[PDB]
Amino acid sequence: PQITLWQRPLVTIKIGGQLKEALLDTGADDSIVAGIELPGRWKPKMIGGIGGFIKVRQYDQILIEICGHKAIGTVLVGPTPVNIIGRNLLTQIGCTLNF
Amino acid sequence: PQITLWQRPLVTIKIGGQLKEALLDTGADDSIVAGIELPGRWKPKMIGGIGGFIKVRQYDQILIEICGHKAIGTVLVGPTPVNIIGRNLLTQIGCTLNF
């Protein structure tokens, strides 16, 4: 479909039974979700953002169904403001920026 | 043109005789630019980000030529690690997220 940036670009995700809403972000190299209970072994990485660095938990091989398109990528769990579906998942779902 | 998100969508911007590169960012409601000397008056505003918060200069009605497309909107100047062309300008040049 096409979205049409007059509204913030939100899509729904299904990540391990938890139905949460997430933003498609073109200027986010990674996807970070807040509030989800994610289960297993994790490698701790530190991410950057603007005036910010937060320790995310890097969990690999997590299936996330983004708006009814599936992608098995890497999701970071953290105290983020809005949930992000960044480039690492956007590529799998075939997302393109156009003008 | 349609940008593939396998590589960061960095576009060239022309803002007041200063040529620079900027990120095409759907997850930012406002466009922020680092310390590029801009002329005029500025209104207080400080915005929400991941990790924290930064104070900017609400500069309304300044022109920015993004990929040779002219747009005029509110640009913010400040402690940004990286440059952003956010939603308030993104829809003026005609940008859509397709999938």
Side-chain angles (χ1 to χ4, degrees):
Chain A
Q2 293 180 54
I3 163 93
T4 306
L5 308 177
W6 298 96
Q7 326 150 100
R8 220 189 292 215
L10 288 158
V11 134
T12 310
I13 57 172
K14 217 296 286 79
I15 178 166
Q18 294 145 94
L19 304 132
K20 221 58 191 172
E21 205 173 82
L23 186 78
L24 299 329
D25 206 324
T26 47
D29 309 346
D30 295 69
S31 304
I32 174 177
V33 182
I36 48 168
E37 302 202 313
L38 232 57
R41 319 181 199 207
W42 41 285
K43 189 148 291 179
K45 244 205 302 80
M46 282 85 165
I47 59 151
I50 49 137
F53 301 133
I54 37 180
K55 261 285 291 79
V56 289
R57 292 191 176 181
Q58 181 196 176
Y59 254 102
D60 300 53
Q61 304 308 115
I62 306 300
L63 166 75
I64 181 174
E65 168 254 278
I66 300 134
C67 197
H69 304 283
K70 287 173 285 179
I72 292 188
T74 307
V75 175
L76 316 168
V77 189
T80 181
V82 184
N83 294 331
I84 293 154
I85 297 300
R87 291 205 301 107
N88 69 324
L89 287 173
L90 292 181
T91 42
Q92 290 198 286
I93 68 171
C95 182
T96 34
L97 203 49
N98 317 243
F99 68 60
Chain B
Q2 58 183 98
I3 310 81
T4 11
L5 299 174
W6 297 90
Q7 192 58 67
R8 285 174 145 174
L10 288 161
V11 77
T12 304
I13 50 164
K14 177 173 169 57
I15 178 172
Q18 293 151 111
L19 286 54
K20 239 65 183 180
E21 279 173 87
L23 242 182
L24 228 47
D25 185 20
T26 48
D29 299 312
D30 291 340
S31 302
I32 211 288
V33 154
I36 248 179
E37 282 147 14
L38 224 61
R41 279 152 31 235
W42 41 277
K43 264 175 289 166
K45 178 151 171 61
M46 33 178 108
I47 29 68
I50 59 126
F53 315 106
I54 44 170
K55 221 217 74 67
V56 284
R57 297 148 187 155
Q58 213 190 135
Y59 263 97
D60 306 77
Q61 286 134 283
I62 313 298
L63 147 135
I64 301 181
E65 196 165 349
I66 308 149
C67 189
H69 294 184
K70 291 138 286 196
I72 185 170
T74 313
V75 191
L76 305 176
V77 184
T80 182
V82 149
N83 290 338
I84 291 152
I85 290 301
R87 282 214 295 109
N88 79 298
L89 278 158
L90 273 176
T91 9
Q92 293 190 282
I93 55 177
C95 196
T96 39
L97 207 52
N98 291 224
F99 61 106

Coordinates of all heavy atoms in Angstrom, one line a residue, chain A residues 1-9 11 23-29 47-54 66-67 69 79-82 84 87 90-99, chain B residues 1-9 11 23-29 47-54 66-67 69 79-82 84 87 90-99:
Chain A
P1 N 0.9 -1.2 0.0 CA 0.0 0.0 0.0 C 0.9 1.2 0.0 O 2.1 1.1 -0.2 CB -0.9 -0.1 1.3 CG 0.0 -1.0 2.1 CD 0.4 -2.0 1.1
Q2 N 0.3 2.4 0.2 CA 1.1 3.7 0.2 C 0.6 4.5 1.4 O -0.6 4.7 1.6 CB 0.8 4.6 -1.0 CG 1.3 4.2 -2.4 CD 0.9 5.3 -3.4 OE1 1.3 6.4 -3.2 NE2 0.2 5.0 -4.4
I3 N 1.5 5.0 2.2 CA 1.3 5.9 3.3 C 2.4 7.0 3.1 O 3.5 6.6 3.0 CB 1.5 5.0 4.7 CG1 1.7 5.9 5.9 CG2 2.6 4.0 4.5 CD1 0.4 6.3 6.6
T4 N 2.3 8.3 3.0 CA 1.3 9.3 3.0 C 1.4 9.9 4.4 O 0.6 9.8 5.3 CB -0.2 8.8 2.8 OG1 -0.1 8.0 1.6 CG2 -1.2 9.9 2.6
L5 N 2.6 10.4 4.5 CA 3.2 11.1 5.6 C 2.6 12.3 6.3 O 3.3 13.2 6.7 CB 4.7 11.3 5.3 CG 5.5 10.1 4.8 CD1 6.9 10.5 4.4 CD2 5.5 9.0 5.8
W6 N 1.3 12.5 6.2 CA 0.6 13.6 6.8 C 0.2 13.1 8.2 O -0.1 13.9 9.2 CB -0.6 14.1 6.1 CG -0.4 14.5 4.7 CD1 -0.6 13.7 3.6 CD2 0.0 15.8 4.2 NE1 -0.3 14.4 2.5 CE2 0.0 15.7 2.8 CE3 0.3 17.1 4.8 CZ2 0.4 16.8 1.9 CZ3 0.6 18.1 4.0 CH2 0.7 18.0 2.5
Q7 N 0.2 11.8 8.4 CA -0.1 11.1 9.6 C 1.2 10.4 9.9 O 2.0 10.1 9.0 CB -1.1 10.0 9.4 CG -2.2 10.3 8.3 CD -2.7 9.0 7.6 OE1 -3.7 8.5 7.9 NE2 -1.9 8.5 6.6
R8 N 1.5 10.1 11.2 CA 2.8 9.4 11.5 C 2.6 8.0 11.0 O 1.6 7.4 11.2 CB 2.9 9.4 13.1 CG 4.4 9.6 13.5 CD 4.6 9.4 15.0 NE 3.9 10.4 15.9 CZ 4.4 10.8 17.1 NH1 5.6 10.4 17.5 NH2 3.7 11.6 17.9
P9 N 3.6 7.4 10.3 CA 3.4 6.1 9.6 C 3.3 4.9 10.5 O 4.4 4.2 10.7 CB 4.6 6.1 8.6 CG 5.7 6.7 9.4 CD 4.9 7.9 9.9
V11 N 1.9 1.1 11.8 CA 1.6 -0.3 11.3 C 1.4 -1.2 12.6 O 1.9 -0.8 13.7 CB 2.7 -0.7 10.4 CG1 3.2 -2.1 10.6 CG2 2.1 -0.6 9.0
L23 N 6.0 2.0 14.4 CA 6.2 3.0 13.4 C 7.2 2.5 12.4 O 8.2 1.9 12.8 CB 6.8 4.2 14.2 CG 7.1 5.5 13.5 CD1 5.8 6.3 13.3 CD2 8.0 6.4 14.3
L24 N 7.0 2.8 11.1 CA 8.0 2.3 10.1 C 8.9 3.5 10.1 O 8.5 4.6 9.7 CB 7.4 2.2 8.7 CG 6.2 1.2 8.3 CD1 6.3 0.0 9.1 CD2 4.9 1.9 8.4
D25 N 10.2 3.3 10.4 CA 11.2 4.4 10.5 C 12.4 4.3 9.5 O 13.3 3.4 9.6 CB 11.7 4.4 11.9 CG 12.3 5.7 12.4 OD1 12.9 6.4 11.7 OD2 12.1 6.0 13.6
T26 N 12.4 5.1 8.4 CA 13.5 5.1 7.5 C 14.9 5.5 8.0 O 15.9 5.3 7.4 CB 13.1 5.9 6.2 OG1 12.6 7.2 6.6 CG2 12.1 5.2 5.4
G27 N 14.9 6.3 9.1 CA 16.1 6.8 9.7 C 16.4 6.1 11.0 O 16.5 6.8 12.0
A28 N 16.3 4.8 11.0 CA 16.5 4.0 12.1 C 17.1 2.7 11.5 O 16.5 2.1 10.6 CB 15.3 3.6 12.9
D29 N 18.4 2.4 11.8 CA 19.1 1.3 11.2 C 18.6 0.0 11.9 O 18.6 -1.1 11.3 CB 20.6 1.5 11.4 CG 21.2 2.8 11.0 OD1 20.6 3.6 10.2 OD2 22.3 3.1 11.4
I47 N 23.1 1.2 21.8 CA 22.8 2.0 20.6 C 22.8 3.4 20.8 O 22.5 4.0 21.9 CB 21.4 1.6 20.0 CG1 20.3 1.9 21.0 CG2 21.4 0.2 19.6 CD1 18.9 2.3 20.4
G48 N 23.0 4.0 19.6 CA 23.0 5.4 19.6 C 21.8 6.0 18.8 O 21.2 5.4 17.9
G49 N 21.6 7.2 19.3 CA 20.5 8.0 18.9 C 21.0 9.4 19.3 O 22.1 9.7 19.8
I50 N 20.0 10.3 19.2 CA 20.3 11.7 19.4 C 20.2 12.1 20.8 O 19.2 11.9 21.4 CB 19.4 12.6 18.5 CG1 17.9 12.3 18.7 CG2 19.7 12.4 17.0 CD1 17.0 13.5 18.9
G51 N 21.3 12.5 21.5 CA 21.4 12.8 22.9 C 21.1 11.5 23.6 O 20.5 11.5 24.7
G52 N 21.5 10.4 23.0 CA 21.1 9.2 23.5 C 21.6 7.9 23.0 O 21.5 7.5 21.8
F53 N 21.9 7.3 24.1 CA 22.6 6.1 24.0 C 21.8 5.3 25.1 O 21.5 5.8 26.2 CB 24.0 6.3 24.5 CG 24.7 7.3 23.6 CD1 25.4 8.3 24.2 CD2 24.7 7.2 22.2 CE1 26.1 9.2 23.4 CE2 25.4 8.1 21.4 CZ 26.1 9.2 22.0
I54 N 21.3 4.1 24.7 CA 20.5 3.2 25.6 C 20.9 1.9 25.2 O 21.3 1.5 24.1 CB 18.9 3.4 25.5 CG1 18.4 3.6 24.1 CG2 18.6 4.5 26.5 CD1 16.9 3.7 24.0
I66 N 4.9 -8.1 10.5 CA 4.7 -6.6 10.3 C 3.5 -6.5 9.3 O 3.7 -6.8 8.1 CB 6.0 -6.0 9.8 CG1 7.1 -6.2 10.7 CG2 5.8 -4.5 9.5 CD1 8.4 -6.7 10.1
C67 N 2.4 -6.0 9.8 CA 1.2 -5.7 9.0 C 0.8 -6.9 8.1 O 0.2 -6.7 7.0 CB 1.5 -4.5 8.2 SG 0.2 -3.5 7.5
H69 N 2.9 -9.3 6.9 CA 4.1 -9.7 6.1 C 5.0 -10.2 7.2 O 5.0 -9.6 8.2 CB 4.7 -8.4 5.4 CG 3.9 -7.5 4.6 ND1 3.5 -7.7 3.3 CD2 3.4 -6.2 4.9 CE1 2.8 -6.7 2.8 NE2 2.8 -5.8 3.8
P79 N 13.9 1.0 26.8 CA 13.0 2.0 27.3 C 12.8 3.0 26.1 O 13.2 4.2 26.2 CB 13.7 2.5 28.5 CG 15.1 2.5 28.1 CD 15.2 1.1 27.5
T80 N 12.3 2.7 24.9 CA 12.1 3.7 23.8 C 10.8 4.4 23.9 O 9.9 3.8 24.5 CB 12.2 2.9 22.4 OG1 12.1 3.9 21.3 CG2 11.1 1.9 22.2
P81 N 10.6 5.7 23.6 CA 9.3 6.4 23.4 C 8.3 5.8 22.4 O 7.1 5.6 22.8 CB 9.7 7.8 23.0 CG 11.1 7.7 22.6 CD 11.6 6.7 23.6
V82 N 8.6 5.5 21.2 CA 7.7 4.9 20.2 C 8.5 3.7 19.6 O 9.7 3.7 19.7 CB 7.4 5.9 19.0 CG1 6.4 5.3 18.1 CG2 6.8 7.2 19.6
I84 N 9.7 1.2 17.0 CA 10.3 1.3 15.7 C 10.6 0.0 15.0 O 11.0 -1.0 15.6 CB 11.7 2.1 16.0 CG1 11.3 3.5 16.4 CG2 12.5 2.1 14.8 CD1 12.3 4.3 17.2
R87 N 15.2 -0.1 9.3 CA 15.7 -0.6 8.0 C 16.0 -2.1 8.0 O 15.7 -2.8 7.0 CB 17.0 0.1 7.6 CG 16.8 1.5 7.1 CD 17.9 2.0 6.2 NE 19.3 1.9 6.7 CZ 20.2 1.0 6.3 NH1 19.9 0.1 5.4 NH2 21.4 1.1 6.8
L90 N 12.5 -3.5 7.5 CA 11.9 -2.8 6.3 C 12.4 -3.4 5.0 O 11.6 -3.5 4.0 CB 12.3 -1.3 6.4 CG 11.6 -0.6 7.5 CD1 11.9 0.9 7.4 CD2 10.1 -0.7 7.4
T91 N 13.6 -3.8 5.0 CA 14.2 -4.4 3.8 C 13.6 -5.8 3.5 O 13.1 -6.0 2.3 CB 15.7 -4.6 4.1 OG1 15.9 -5.1 5.4 CG2 16.4 -3.2 3.9
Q92 N 13.4 -6.6 4.5 CA 12.7 -7.9 4.4 C 11.3 -7.8 3.8 O 10.9 -8.6 3.0 CB 12.7 -8.7 5.7 CG 14.0 -9.2 6.2 CD 13.9 -10.3 7.3 OE1 13.6 -10.0 8.4 NE2 14.1 -11.5 6.9
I93 N 10.5 -6.8 4.4 CA 9.1 -6.6 3.9 C 9.1 -5.8 2.6 O 7.9 -5.6 2.1 CB 8.3 -5.8 5.0 CG1 8.7 -4.3 5.2 CG2 8.4 -6.6 6.3 CD1 7.7 -3.6 6.0
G94 N 10.2 -5.4 2.0 CA 10.2 -4.8 0.6 C 9.9 -3.3 0.5 O 9.6 -2.8 -0.5
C95 N 10.0 -2.6 1.7 CA 9.6 -1.2 1.8 C 10.5 -0.3 1.0 O 11.7 -0.4 1.0 CB 9.6 -0.9 3.3 SG 9.2 0.7 3.8
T96 N 9.9 0.7 0.3 CA 10.6 1.7 -0.5 C 10.1 3.1 -0.2 O 8.9 3.3 0.1 CB 10.4 1.4 -2.0 OG1 9.1 0.9 -2.3 CG2 11.5 0.4 -2.5
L97 N 11.0 4.1 -0.3 CA 10.7 5.5 0.0 C 10.5 6.1 -1.4 O 11.3 5.8 -2.3 CB 11.9 6.1 0.8 CG 11.7 7.3 1.6 CD1 10.5 7.2 2.6 CD2 12.9 7.5 2.4
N98 N 9.4 6.8 -1.7 CA 9.3 7.3 -3.1 C 8.8 8.8 -3.2 O 8.0 9.2 -2.3 CB 8.2 6.5 -3.9 CG 8.3 5.0 -3.8 OD1 8.5 4.3 -4.7 ND2 8.0 4.5 -2.6
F99 N 9.2 9.4 -4.3 CA 8.9 10.8 -4.7 C 9.6 11.0 -6.1 O 9.9 10.0 -6.7 CB 9.4 11.9 -3.6 CG 10.9 12.1 -3.3 CD1 11.8 12.6 -4.2 CD2 11.3 12.0 -2.0 CE1 13.1 12.9 -3.9 CE2 12.7 12.3 -1.6 CZ 13.5 12.7 -2.6
Chain B
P1 N 12.5 10.2 -6.9 CA 13.0 8.8 -7.3 C 12.6 7.9 -6.2 O 12.4 8.5 -5.1 CB 14.5 8.9 -7.5 CG 14.5 10.3 -8.1 CD 13.6 11.1 -7.1
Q2 N 12.6 6.6 -6.3 CA 12.2 5.7 -5.2 C 13.6 5.2 -4.6 O 14.4 4.8 -5.4 CB 11.4 4.6 -5.7 CG 11.9 3.7 -6.8 CD 10.9 2.6 -7.2 OE1 10.2 2.8 -8.2 NE2 10.8 1.5 -6.5
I3 N 13.8 5.4 -3.3 CA 15.0 5.0 -2.6 C 14.7 3.6 -2.0 O 13.7 3.3 -1.4 CB 15.3 6.0 -1.5 CG1 15.4 7.5 -2.0 CG2 16.8 5.7 -1.0 CD1 14.1 8.3 -2.1
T4 N 15.7 2.8 -2.2 CA 15.7 1.4 -1.7 C 16.3 1.6 -0.3 O 17.2 2.4 -0.1 CB 16.7 0.4 -2.5 OG1 17.5 1.2 -3.4 CG2 15.8 -0.5 -3.3
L5 N 15.8 0.9 0.7 CA 16.3 1.0 2.1 C 17.4 0.1 2.5 O 17.6 -0.2 3.7 CB 15.1 1.0 3.1 CG 14.1 2.0 2.8 CD1 12.9 1.7 3.7 CD2 14.6 3.4 3.1
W6 N 18.1 -0.5 1.6 CA 19.2 -1.5 1.9 C 20.4 -0.6 2.3 O 21.2 -1.0 3.1 CB 19.6 -2.3 0.6 CG 18.5 -3.2 0.1 CD1 17.5 -2.8 -0.8 CD2 18.2 -4.5 0.5 NE1 16.7 -3.8 -1.0 CE2 17.0 -4.9 -0.3 CE3 18.7 -5.4 1.4 CZ2 16.4 -6.1 -0.1 CZ3 18.1 -6.7 1.5 CH2 17.0 -7.0 0.8
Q7 N 20.5 0.6 1.8 CA 21.5 1.5 2.1 C 20.7 2.8 2.6 O 19.6 3.0 2.1 CB 22.3 1.9 0.8 CG 23.7 2.6 1.0 CD 24.7 1.9 1.9 OE1 25.2 0.9 1.6 NE2 25.0 2.5 3.0
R8 N 21.3 3.4 3.6 CA 20.7 4.6 4.2 C 20.2 5.6 3.2 O 21.0 6.0 2.3 CB 21.7 5.3 5.1 CG 21.9 4.6 6.4 CD 23.1 5.3 7.2 NE 22.9 5.3 8.6 CZ 23.8 5.7 9.5 NH1 24.9 6.2 9.1 NH2 23.5 5.7 10.8
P9 N 19.0 6.1 3.2 CA 18.5 7.1 2.3 C 19.0 8.6 2.5 O 18.3 9.5 2.8 CB 17.0 7.0 2.5 CG 16.8 6.7 3.9 CD 17.9 5.7 4.1
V11 N 20.1 12.0 1.3 CA 19.8 12.9 0.2 C 20.6 14.3 0.4 O 20.9 14.6 1.5 CB 18.3 13.2 0.0 CG1 17.8 14.1 1.1 CG2 18.0 13.7 -1.4
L23 N 19.3 12.7 6.2 CA 18.5 11.5 6.2 C 17.1 11.7 5.9 O 16.5 12.7 6.4 CB 18.6 10.9 7.6 CG 19.3 9.5 7.8 CD1 19.1 9.2 9.2 CD2 18.6 8.4 6.9
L24 N 16.4 10.9 5.2 CA 15.0 11.0 4.8 C 14.5 10.2 6.0 O 14.6 8.9 6.0 CB 14.8 10.3 3.4 CG 14.0 11.1 2.4 CD1 14.5 12.6 2.3 CD2 14.3 10.5 1.0
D25 N 13.8 10.8 6.9 CA 13.3 10.1 8.1 C 11.8 10.2 8.5 O 11.3 11.2 9.1 CB 14.2 10.6 9.3 CG 14.0 10.1 10.7 OD1 13.4 9.0 10.8 OD2 14.5 10.7 11.6
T26 N 11.1 9.1 8.2 CA 9.6 9.0 8.4 C 9.2 9.0 9.9 O 8.1 9.4 10.3 CB 9.1 7.7 7.8 OG1 9.9 6.5 8.2 CG2 9.0 7.8 6.3
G27 N 10.1 8.6 10.8 CA 9.9 8.6 12.2 C 10.1 9.9 12.9 O 10.2 9.9 14.1
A28 N 10.3 11.0 12.3 CA 10.6 12.3 12.9 C 9.5 13.2 12.5 O 9.3 13.4 11.3 CB 12.0 12.9 12.5
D29 N 8.8 13.8 13.4 CA 7.7 14.7 13.0 C 8.3 16.1 12.5 O 7.8 16.7 11.6 CB 6.8 15.0 14.2 CG 6.1 13.7 14.7 OD1 5.5 12.9 13.9 OD2 6.1 13.5 15.9
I47 N 12.4 19.2 21.7 CA 11.6 18.0 21.3 C 12.0 16.6 21.9 O 13.1 16.5 22.4 CB 11.7 17.9 19.8 CG1 12.9 18.4 19.1 CG2 10.5 18.6 19.2 CD1 14.2 17.7 19.4
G48 N 11.1 15.6 21.9 CA 11.3 14.3 22.5 C 12.0 13.3 21.5 O 11.6 13.2 20.4
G49 N 13.0 12.6 22.0 CA 13.8 11.6 21.2 C 14.1 10.4 22.0 O 13.6 10.3 23.2
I50 N 14.8 9.4 21.4 CA 15.0 8.2 22.2 C 16.3 8.5 22.9 O 17.2 9.1 22.4 CB 15.3 6.9 21.3 CG1 16.4 7.0 20.3 CG2 14.0 6.6 20.5 CD1 17.5 5.9 20.4
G51 N 16.4 8.0 24.1 CA 17.5 8.3 25.0 C 17.1 9.6 25.7 O 17.0 9.5 26.9
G52 N 16.9 10.8 25.0 CA 16.5 12.0 25.7 C 15.8 13.1 25.0 O 14.9 12.9 24.2
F53 N 16.3 14.2 25.3 CA 15.8 15.4 24.9 C 16.8 16.5 24.4 O 17.8 16.7 25.1 CB 14.9 16.1 25.9 CG 14.0 15.1 26.6 CD1 14.3 14.7 27.9 CD2 12.9 14.6 26.0 CE1 13.5 13.9 28.6 CE2 12.0 13.7 26.6 CZ 12.3 13.4 27.9
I54 N 16.5 17.3 23.4 CA 17.4 18.4 22.9 C 16.6 19.6 22.7 O 15.4 19.6 22.4 CB 18.2 18.0 21.6 CG1 17.4 17.3 20.5 CG2 19.3 17.1 22.1 CD1 18.2 17.2 19.2
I66 N 15.5 20.0 -1.3 CA 15.8 18.5 -1.1 C 15.7 17.9 -2.5 O 14.6 17.8 -3.1 CB 14.7 17.9 -0.2 CG1 14.5 18.6 1.1 CG2 15.2 16.4 0.1 CD1 13.1 18.5 1.7
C67 N 16.8 17.4 -3.0 CA 16.9 16.7 -4.3 C 16.3 17.5 -5.4 O 15.3 17.2 -6.0 CB 16.3 15.3 -4.2 SG 16.5 14.1 -5.6
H69 N 14.1 19.7 -5.2 CA 12.6 20.0 -5.0 C 12.6 21.0 -3.9 O 13.3 20.9 -2.9 CB 11.9 18.7 -4.6 CG 11.8 17.6 -5.6 ND1 11.1 16.4 -5.4 CD2 12.4 17.5 -6.8 CE1 11.3 15.6 -6.4 NE2 12.1 16.2 -7.3
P79 N 21.8 20.2 19.0 CA 22.6 19.1 19.4 C 22.2 17.7 18.8 O 21.8 16.8 19.5 CB 22.5 19.1 20.9 CG 22.3 20.5 21.2 CD 21.2 20.8 20.2
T80 N 22.2 17.7 17.5 CA 21.8 16.5 16.8 C 23.1 15.8 16.5 O 24.1 16.4 16.1 CB 21.0 16.7 15.5 OG1 20.6 15.4 15.1 CG2 21.7 17.4 14.4
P81 N 23.3 14.5 16.9 CA 24.3 13.6 16.3 C 24.1 13.5 14.8 O 25.2 13.6 14.1 CB 24.0 12.3 17.0 CG 23.9 12.8 18.4 CD 22.9 13.9 18.1
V82 N 22.9 13.4 14.2 CA 22.8 13.3 12.8 C 21.6 14.1 12.1 O 20.5 14.2 12.8 CB 22.7 11.8 12.3 CG1 21.9 11.5 11.1 CG2 24.1 11.4 11.9
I84 N 18.4 15.3 9.9 CA 17.1 14.7 9.5 C 16.1 15.6 8.8 O 15.9 16.7 9.1 CB 16.5 14.3 10.9 CG1 17.2 13.0 11.4 CG2 15.0 13.9 10.8 CD1 17.2 12.9 13.0
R87 N 9.0 14.5 8.6 CA 7.6 14.6 8.1 C 7.1 16.0 7.6 O 6.7 16.0 6.5 CB 6.6 14.0 9.0 CG 6.6 12.5 9.0 CD 5.2 11.9 9.3 NE 4.6 12.2 10.6 CZ 3.6 13.1 10.8 NH1 3.0 13.8 9.8 NH2 3.1 13.2 12.0
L90 N 8.9 16.4 4.4 CA 8.8 15.2 3.6 C 7.5 15.1 2.7 O 7.5 14.6 1.6 CB 8.8 13.9 4.4 CG 10.2 13.4 4.7 CD1 10.2 12.2 5.6 CD2 10.9 12.9 3.4
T91 N 6.4 15.6 3.3 CA 5.2 15.5 2.5 C 5.1 16.7 1.4 O 4.4 16.5 0.4 CB 3.9 15.5 3.4 OG1 4.3 15.8 4.8 CG2 3.3 14.2 3.2
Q92 N 5.9 17.8 1.6 CA 5.9 18.9 0.7 C 6.6 18.5 -0.6 O 6.3 19.0 -1.7 CB 6.6 20.1 1.2 CG 5.9 20.8 2.4 CD 6.5 22.1 2.8 OE1 7.6 22.1 3.4 NE2 6.0 23.2 2.3
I93 N 7.6 17.6 -0.5 CA 8.3 17.2 -1.7 C 7.6 16.0 -2.4 O 8.0 15.6 -3.5 CB 9.8 16.8 -1.4 CG1 9.9 15.7 -0.3 CG2 10.5 18.1 -1.1 CD1 11.3 15.3 0.0
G94 N 6.6 15.4 -1.6 CA 5.8 14.3 -2.1 C 6.2 12.9 -1.8 O 5.9 12.0 -2.5
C95 N 6.7 12.6 -0.6 CA 7.2 11.3 -0.2 C 6.2 10.3 0.4 O 5.4 10.6 1.2 CB 8.4 11.5 0.8 SG 9.5 10.1 1.0
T96 N 6.3 9.1 -0.2 CA 5.4 8.0 0.2 C 6.2 6.7 0.6 O 7.3 6.5 0.0 CB 4.4 7.6 -0.9 OG1 5.0 7.7 -2.1 CG2 3.2 8.5 -0.8
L97 N 5.7 5.9 1.4 CA 6.3 4.7 1.9 C 5.5 3.7 1.2 O 4.2 3.6 1.3 CB 6.2 4.6 3.4 CG 7.1 3.8 4.3 CD1 8.6 4.2 4.0 CD2 6.8 4.2 5.7
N98 N 6.1 2.9 0.3 CA 5.4 1.8 -0.5 C 5.9 0.5 -0.1 O 7.1 0.4 0.3 CB 5.7 2.0 -2.0 CG 5.1 3.2 -2.7 OD1 4.6 3.1 -3.8 ND2 5.2 4.4 -2.1
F99 N 5.0 -0.5 -0.2 CA 5.1 -1.9 0.1 C 3.7 -2.5 0.0 O 3.0 -2.1 -1.0 CB 5.7 -2.2 1.6 CG 5.1 -1.7 2.9 CD1 4.5 -2.7 3.7 CD2 5.1 -0.4 3.3 CE1 3.9 -2.3 4.9 CE2 4.6 0.0 4.5 CZ 4.0 -1.0 5.3

